[PDB]
Amino acid sequence: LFVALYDFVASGDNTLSITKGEKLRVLGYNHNGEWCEAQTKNGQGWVPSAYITPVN
């Protein structure tokens, strides 16, 4: 369980828009850890790893 730190607008290509404060579930990471595949109420897709952090 994670929370978004900053807004991120999807740039297509299976990225996912997220808003500061939203909760996410993390499925995994790409090969260099820069991208994170996450699930929110809005769907599923890749977000910047640095834009989220664990919560609770």
């Binding site: 730190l5 900053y6 991120f8 990225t15 834009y51």
Partner: peptide
């Protein structure tokens, strides 16, 4: 995942 890097945190 995208082949390009994500934006840096603000």
């Amino acid at each position: 995942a995208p082949t390009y890097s994500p934006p840096l945190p603000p």
